[PDB]
Amino acid sequence: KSAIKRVKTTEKAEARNISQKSAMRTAVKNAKTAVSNNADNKNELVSLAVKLVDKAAQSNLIHSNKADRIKSQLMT
Amino acid sequence: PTINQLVRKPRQSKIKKSDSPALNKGFNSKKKKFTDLNSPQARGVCTRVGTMTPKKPNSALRKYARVRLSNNIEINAYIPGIGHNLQEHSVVLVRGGRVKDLPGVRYHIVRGALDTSGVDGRRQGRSLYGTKKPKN
Amino acid sequence: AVKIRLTRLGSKRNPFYRIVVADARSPRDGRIIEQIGTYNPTSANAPEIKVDEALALKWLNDGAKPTDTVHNILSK
Amino acid sequence: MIQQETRLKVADNSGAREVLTIKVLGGSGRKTANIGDVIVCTVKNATPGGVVKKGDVVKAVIVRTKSGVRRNDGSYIKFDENACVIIRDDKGPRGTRIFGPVARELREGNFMKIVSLAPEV
């Protein structure tokens, strides 16, 4: 039973990505609201952070690395 | 016939049927093995001591055993040899092959491995009847 | 990539080999890619080493991991 | 309050469903019963694939009821469904499991198996 210790990573690895993912998407869900206003204040310098979390489809690899371009392919 | 027609319908060949009906197929499943296939052999359980005759011109007497097989169905039989240590509801091995000039009997009760175990009275034709001689 | 492998054949009390190469994902008995020639384990009324290094250099270019007792063939 | 021709569910896997009531066992002229008395049921509906077939006089015990019982402390209890358990000739249930909360009243040293099979009591 050496997959007992594999379970303890599995309830532990859910927390890191689902925090990163839910912060990836609400930074992006507010972004297309900010891209619906386009005042260059609530959209600038966090859209590349919305692309840094779409670059954290390579850092936070729970979203797959080759799947980095499934959302970020339109705004920038 | 014509090669045009042979394209439109092939030669659906002649079906044949088994000479001995009451064995060897997947029968009638009822959430258990309610009935099954016995390709060469089976068990039995007896129901009746049999005494009968041939019917064509012949006038002898024959001793069958009307049973119920291990798959709910009803067949006659025959004991080859001399001895009869059989009574009603005793286990009998089976093996196929009908008996001519008897009107409806079906198989042969194997005289070797059953309650039909061994038949004395025979000394030369032996392994057709299950009789031993450990000297030779 | 691929790993250089000896397919064991042979009856009771008598093994015999055939030099093949495939990935470790493939098993020993079959799904083998190529064969650079036979290999002769027993030495009585039989040879002891057999290899053909023509199509063996085709697999050391894209990567190959020979087992450390198979490498004594190609060191000779 | 059970009666002389009311219907009841059966709460076990004894091969039955809604059974009727024929008569309430006890004294004479008896007209009601409640949790923990025997009756005489008859099977009006059955699960095909059981050991009790439809149209067959069996006993039962009333296990739940919509009326309830009153305890020593004044606490009441009310279920929302009537149910019973087919019982054999000596006191023990015919089935194997029991699909519901039996009443807390049910045993007296007597039905020491029906309360040993419920999910909660």
Partner: protein, 82 residues
């Protein structure tokens, strides 16, 4: 796309936008009786601006998939007759 197989065949009917059916002929040999026999699968075909009508002989290239059996792609007009 750029280099795909070709099944030249008659155009049956233009019945919706961007959609026809281009029937082809195929005589297939039998297994043992030897005499050939016809089979005509009627494959649907996307065409660009309703360029086809009833009866044309065309040239077909394949593509990457679109929908249920819309799998071919019309190219030419060898015959523009009725």
């Amino acid at each position: 796309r750029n280099d795909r197989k070709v099944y030249v065949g008659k155009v049956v009917s233009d019945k919706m936008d961007k959609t026809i059916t281009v029937l082809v002929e195929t005589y297939k040999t039998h297994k043992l009786y030897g005499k050939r026999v016809k089979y005509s699968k009627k494959y649907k075909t996307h065409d660009e601006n309703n360029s086809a009508k009833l009866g044309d002989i065309v040239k077909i290239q394949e593509t990457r998939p679109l929908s249920a059996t819309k799998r071919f792609r019309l190219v030419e007009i060898v015959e523009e007759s009725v």
